[PDB]
Design a protein around this ligand. Sequence first.
Ligand SMILES: Nc1nc2c(ncn2[C@@H]2O[C@H](COP(=O)(O)OP(=O)(O)OP(O)(O)=S)[C@@H](O)[C@H]2O)c(=O)[nH]1
Lengths: 305, 293
Amino acid sequence: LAVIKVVGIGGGGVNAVNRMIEQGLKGVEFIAINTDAQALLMSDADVKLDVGRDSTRGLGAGADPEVGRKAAEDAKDEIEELLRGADMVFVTAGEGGGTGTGGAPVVASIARKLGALTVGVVTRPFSFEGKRRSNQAENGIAALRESCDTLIVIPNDRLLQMGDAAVSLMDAFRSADEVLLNGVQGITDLITTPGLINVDFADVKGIMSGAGTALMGIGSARGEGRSLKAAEIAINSPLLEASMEGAQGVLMSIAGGSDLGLFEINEAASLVQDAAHPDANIIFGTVIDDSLGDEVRVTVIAAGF
Amino acid sequence: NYLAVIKVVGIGGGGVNAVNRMIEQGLKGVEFIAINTDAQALLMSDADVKLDVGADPEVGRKAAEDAKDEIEELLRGADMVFVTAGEGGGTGTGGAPVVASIARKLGALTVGVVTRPFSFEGKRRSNQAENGIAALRESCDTLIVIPNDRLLQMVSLMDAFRSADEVLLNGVQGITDLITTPGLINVDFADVKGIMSGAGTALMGIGSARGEGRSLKAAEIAINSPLLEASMEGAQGVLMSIAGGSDLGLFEINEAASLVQDAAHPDANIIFGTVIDDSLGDEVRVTVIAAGF
Ligand SMILES: Nc1nc2c(ncn2[C@@H]2O[C@H](COP(=O)(O)OP(=O)(O)OP(O)(O)=S)[C@@H](O)[C@H]2O)c(=O)[nH]1
């Protein structure tokens, strides 16, 4: 029985976590960490830690990653005591600001020192947010990559090539929330709510330990050929950056109702094998989600390029 | 007065987190108080009462001494006060003895709970973990000490940390449930205060079993628990609680009570009772608190 903790750090990471809780992600503990007390009062997370209170006064790191790093580092004994006991820790954030960029690698190092399987799931900021945010994100992601077993990086620019062409700014960030949720859930649900093909904590640990930098694809479909269509959308996802063909490690999850049959699961698995690198290690798992109706949802995590 | 007022104080990050765990598990019958002692960080809490007085012990001490009047008003009216800094050190280990000394000067039966870290955790300067224990011991009636090393005789690294949190919770719940939650055998609060006032250091033992002979079996595990450090023979004050379902029988109960008397020192005071927790199914859980020598 694996204990899984999902940490959101900074405003975007805390909003993603609220989204995960709102959509009913189960079997995990939710921890919100931020440098803004008011923002934390609105969070529904199980654990809420306000950090950098004297350096920031509950107003955020003002986009300075050094302030975020030092806020997390000063609270490190306390974060450690919140994490101890976890088998698996997710660290989620929008890279580019001060709190998430700076604090995420601290939270991840602590998880990794404890020997929890440590997965980062972060976005790169949209190009329209400016060169400073993109540059801070890039350094934040390099730092985090040193501290995580696997680091899933979602390029927010690619999200604009999905969903609706007439989205607002608020919509774009809700979509970033959703994808961070998809990243976490596509993995955690293999463990907490397996279907016919059970990929347990040990299997996940074996493919994700020390895997390095990763990308994700997602796909969903209904009606005839839903499994094949969902997998083909996930494999060709703009978030995966056309790089599925080069990944050496691939974890795939297919979610559907109680009645998702082996035939459908296997058809999706077969399309994914064919698209993969010839020497790829691919693990295929299933998820029971009875709220899905006639839809199935495929998530692909690709690493080892 | 007649429903004993019990206040459980978590202080510092490990203490507030312990209290938040107690709330999450539905520990009943007590009032929870979360005291944050760090200037730079605040762990939030759903405790009834919260005080933010904000990793050095001296820092926590000074912060709580500064807030001594408001802590006093939070504690006034309690018959019993538990204080803990929970797992890991920090400012809470400095604040805990201050809250304890205020509880005790008010007349409340003051019970500290403190953990000794696992040895593989290493050690911070100035012997600060033992200084915390010594200072907390000076200001409590009873100090329950949980030696985390002993858990490894009861294991993976994650299991070790999890068992530590679980036994810490039990350090409070085994006693509070005995007092606050009816069972077939109930106790007098005066007798609790009789064994625990001025008693000094105590240790705890736990045991669980199912099926035939469950009560005897869980009691036997509890009495021989590595966490008791074989202090059962010499102990002058013993509390034993047996938690189980409604159908817990008087005969099996009494067999457990008889075992504890036999195992304990001839001159021991023994307080014994049961707790009805209908969520345990066919399982029985025993807590033994051994105090004195
Ligand atoms: N997923 C998600 N991402 C967001 C949201 N708001 C902003 N972002 C993204 O996250 C990045 C970091 O912003 P944010 O998380 O708010 O900063 P912070 O880490 O809290 O940093 P600060 O203390 O300096 S204000 C932004 O550059 C943007 O790309 C949100 O609501 N949800």
